[PDB]
Design a protein around this ligand. Structure first.
Ligand code: ADP
Ligand code: BEF
Ligand code: CA
Ligand code: CA
Ligand code: CA
Ligand code: CA
Ligand code: MG
Lengths: 145, 724
């Protein structure tokens, strides 16, 4: 299970699913956010995953149920691969660096509203080595803050 | 200083200013009436919303939630034809006294389906949907308690509930129709024109819709309480007997008219915007629709007509012929029964007691007949709607008021318990961290020592007397906190009542002085055996089956009420408080003091007192973001209501004592929402500076939100693989 801090981060991430907020989500929001980040689950796959925690039967899910749904037995090697995979969601061209334009793609896919100037500020605050781009180390450091 | 609300004898509250403070009372100058002053107790002067023009759908959105600000919010909304307003989960409904457009359409019904409370404007439809949803999700029967004075709007809102549920979640056929036609049929026999309501329900009802395990409608069941027996024979100057009597006289065909020997109502001792002809038509429609054939319909009509002619016998020959004929009796058997050696008064009361008993048993038959039209072998859950009158002003309080106020004590207790439970669950879920009226209930209903049992004892005495009964009450409960003697009253006319002629009970809603003349006789529903035997040997099968010397009215009702509470206690409960705006049945006329008094009597002010104990101000992130984004820098206005509010909390450094950042809402201690509003309305540049110093944290929060969201999507992806 999760640390108090991990839970806190996922709760903020959950608001991106639960946009009306509200506090609950359905299969509808699951797929949209999933597609928004380059995944393409079918409706039967969503329905079947929902089934574990929709206990219930009403087709809606709250935050603790969402955490349970993300949970599974993992290898020693698994959590690092997932974080690397998250970085690749941002680094769309696979050159090892997240550019301003790549962040904007992700931000805007998720419905975030900010100016190009504010996209540049985000890059600047994460950009520790100062080359104007976010590499893996800096990405992780930010995620861990 | 700032304007405040202070008492007003006809408006309830009025705007004024505090011009002086005392230790017990404040000195108030009414707005613009310089030189005019009056005194008010400190606890009766309330802060006012700065914006006197705004209205809110949920009173928990007010910066100051008290009886005055609530009165005002409801007033504004009502003047804009918004009759419905929330106090958290409680619905307040003000009677408009006219047909407001759009809000009851089938298409409006559709817009409410599946929506959470607060996502749509306040409506009876929303209370109905939450009840279906909760029944289905929680697998728990549900109740909707619709309360208020005569003419407040209980019956109408009950009918809106049943319309909503059948249209939204009904079968599509033929049982849905019977659910909505059941009450209008009962209203024929149980409703009457009174001085308070042209269509007053002279009985209480609990109407259940039953569902199967799949939450599909399988049936219905109606319970009925306390039919007003006295109205059958005599009615007040500006009042009528039950509708059926006038509908039959007005609308029956010449054929039925000849068979039943009917004329205009002025030909009967027992007997406008009232369309009796039209209503008869509608009644016949309902009867056919629910499966009554013409034989039964006529069996009902004959008994009604039989009661009418019975009332025409004064101490006639022709009325005796008609009555005995229709009720299937030998004239001579009837004449003897009403005269066996009796005085004129005793003869009238024999005729009246028979008429009452026959009619009441007809009403029982009609209620049962209606339940026979949507029967069920089994069900899993029900949604029940309670429609009964509560406490209301009468200049004379007799046994009828005693029974109704006793009912109100038990139902008010349920409401108190339930509202407390709802609030506890909120504070626990969100991490926020009473005076029973059982003694008054016990005074009335306790075995052996309660008033109902003492009354029954009197009825059983060889020479029952109202005065003996009243004295027995006073001796038994001399020192009870809830019982008092009339001569102790501050009102002169109460002090005119002798100790053995009344008592005062300190009910939830306030002291009630009961005059106890006729308590003994009113507590007895029995019919003398000479009369009951007569009607039991009717040549008519139907009249015999109605019936196929003391019966306690109070203890009969106590049994019924206890069964009702067993049911209610097994349900999740929702509450609609109906409010009569004036005593004139007129629209756009808000009588502040009359409405304020209803809000006090029905326990709403008490509900507000509870909420002032914790976090009475409650606002969703979306509501706050919409209200306050204009005060903040553009960068902040570009979030995301949740992160917007998070950033505010961080930039202002709101403490954990006064402010609670909830799961979906901000919860404020009393006065703190006003303080927050004040902070937002200063000083644009300083506010900007507070945001600036929080900037790095905000950028990091934005980063992590999206970073941790993509990690979530990866785990969701990986999960789907784990399951395959
Ligand atoms: N929401 C409403 N819309 C239109 N008319 C209403 C509404 N509520 C009440 N009325 C009117 O007021 C009268 C009294 O309402 P009713 O529901 O019979 O009161 P109660 O059952 O509380 O004694 C109704 O006959 C109807 O004319
Ligand atoms: F006159 Be109402 F049905 F309380
Ligand atoms: Ca949601
Ligand atoms: Ca669920
Ligand atoms: Ca790249
Ligand atoms: Ca870099
Ligand atoms: Mg009614």
């Amino acid at each position: 299970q999760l640390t108090e801090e991990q839970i806190a981060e996922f709760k903020e991430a959950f608001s991106l699913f639960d946009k009306d907020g509200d506090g609950t989500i359905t299969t509808k929001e699951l797929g949209t956010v999933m597609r928004s980040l380059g995944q393409n689950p079918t409706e039967a796959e969503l329905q079947d995953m929902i089934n574990e925690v929709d206990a219930d039967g009403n087709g809606t899910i709250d935050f603790p149920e969402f955490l349970t749904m993300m949970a599974r037995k993992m290898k020693d090697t698994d959590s690092e691969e997932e974080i690397r995979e998250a970085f690749r969601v941002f680094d769309k061209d696979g050159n090892g660096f997240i550019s301003a334009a790549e962040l904007r793609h992700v931000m805007t896919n998720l419905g975030e509203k900010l100016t190009d100037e504010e996209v540049d500020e985000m890059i600047r605050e994460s950009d520790i080595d100062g080359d104007g781009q976010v590499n893996y180390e800096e990405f992780v450091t930010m995620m861990t803050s | 200083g700032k304007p405040v609300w202070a008492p007003h004898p006809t408006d309830g509250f009025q705007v004024g200013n505090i011009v002086d403070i005392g230790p017990d009372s404040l000195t108030i100058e009414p707005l613009n009436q310089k030189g005019k002053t009056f005194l008010a107790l400190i606890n009766q002067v309330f802060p006012a919303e700065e914006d006197s023009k705004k209205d809110v759908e949920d009173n928990c959105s007010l910066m100051y939630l008290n009886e005055a600000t609530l009165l005002h919010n409801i007033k504004v909304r009502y003047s804009k034809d918004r009759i419905y307003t929330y106090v958290a989960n409680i619905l307040i409904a003000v009677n408009p006294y006219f047909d407001i457009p759009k809000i009851y359409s089938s298409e409006t019904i559709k817009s409410y389906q599946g929506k959470s409370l607060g996502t749509m404007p306040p409506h009876v439809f929303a209370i109905a949907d939450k009840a279906f949803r909760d029944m289905k999700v929680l697998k728990l029967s549900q109740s909707i308690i619709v309360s208020g004075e005569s003419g407040a709007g209980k019956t109408e809102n009950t009918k809106f509930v049943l319309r909503y549920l059948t249209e939204s979640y009904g079968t599509g056929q033929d049982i849905d129709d019977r659910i909505v036609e059941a009450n209008p049929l009962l209203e024929a026999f149980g409703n009457a024109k009174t001085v308070r309501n042209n269509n007053s329900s002279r009985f209480g009802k609990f109407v259940e819709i039953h569902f199967n395990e799949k939450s599909s409608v399988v049936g219905g069941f109606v319970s009925h309480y306390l039919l007003e027996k006295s109205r059958i024979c005599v009615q007040g100057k500006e009042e009528r007997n039950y509708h059926i009597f006038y509908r039959l006289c007005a609308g029956a065909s010449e054929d039925i008219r000849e068979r039943l020997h009917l004329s205009s109502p002025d030909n009967f001792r027992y007997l406008p915007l009232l369309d009796d002809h039209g209503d008869f038509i509608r009644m016949c429609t309902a009867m056919k629709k629910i499966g009554l054939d013409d034989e039964e319909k006529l069996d009902l009509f004959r008994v009604v007509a039989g009661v009418l002619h019975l009332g025409n016998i004064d101490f006639s020959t022709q009325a005796l012929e008609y009555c005995a004929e229709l009720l299937g009796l030998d004239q001579d058997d009837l004449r003897v029964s009403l005269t066996t050696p009796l005085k004129v008064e005793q003869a009238n009361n024999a005729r009246d007691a028979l008429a009452k008993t026959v009619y009441s048993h007809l009403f029982d038959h009609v209620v049962n007949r209606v339940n026979q039209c949507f029967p069920f072998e089994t069900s899993s859950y029900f949604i029940g709607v309670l429609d009964i009158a509560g406490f209301e002003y009468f200049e004379h309080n007799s046994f009828e008021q005693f029974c109704i106020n006793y009912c109100n004590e038990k139902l008010q207790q349920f409401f108190n318990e339930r509202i407390l439970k709802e609030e506890q669950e909120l504070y626990q879920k969100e991490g926020l961290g009473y005076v029973d009226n059982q003694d008054c209930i016990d005074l009335i209903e306790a075995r052996l020592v309660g008033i109902l049992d003492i009354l029954d004892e009197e009825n059983r005495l060889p020479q029952p007397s109202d005065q003996h009964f009243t004295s027995a009450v006073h001796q038994k409960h001399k020192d009870h906190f809830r019982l008092s003697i009339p001569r102790k009253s501050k009102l002169a006319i109460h002090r005119n009542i002798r100790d053995d002629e009344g008592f005062i009970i300190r009910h939830f809603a306030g002291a009630v002085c009961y005059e106890t003349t006729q308590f003994v006789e009113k507590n007895n529903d029995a019919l003398h055996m000479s009369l009951e035997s007569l009607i039991c040997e009717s040549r008519d099968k139907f009249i015999r089956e109605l019936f196929e010397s003391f019966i306690s009215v109070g203890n009969k009702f106590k049994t019924q009420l206890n069964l009702l509470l067993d049911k209610l206690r097994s349900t999740g409960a929702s509450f609609i408080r109906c409010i009569k705006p004036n005593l004139k049945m007129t629209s756009h006329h808000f009588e502040g003091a009359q409405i304020l008094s209803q809000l006090q009597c029905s326990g709403m002010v008490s509900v507000l007192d509870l909420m002032q104990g914790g976090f009475p101000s409650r606002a969703s992130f979306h509501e706050l973001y919409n209200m306050y984004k204009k005060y903040m820098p553009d960068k902040l206005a570009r979030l995301d209501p949740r992160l917007f509010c998070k950033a505010l909390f961080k930039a202002l450094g709101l403490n954990e004592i006064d402010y609670k950042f909830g799961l979906t809402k901000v919860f404020f201690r009393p006065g703190k929402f006003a303080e927050f509003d004040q902070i937002m309305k200063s000083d644009p540049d300083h506010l900007a500076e507070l945001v600036k110093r929080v900037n790095h944290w905000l950028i990091c929060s934005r980063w992590k939100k999206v970073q941790w969201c993509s990690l979530s999507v990866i785990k969701l992806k990986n999960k789907i693989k784990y399951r395959a």
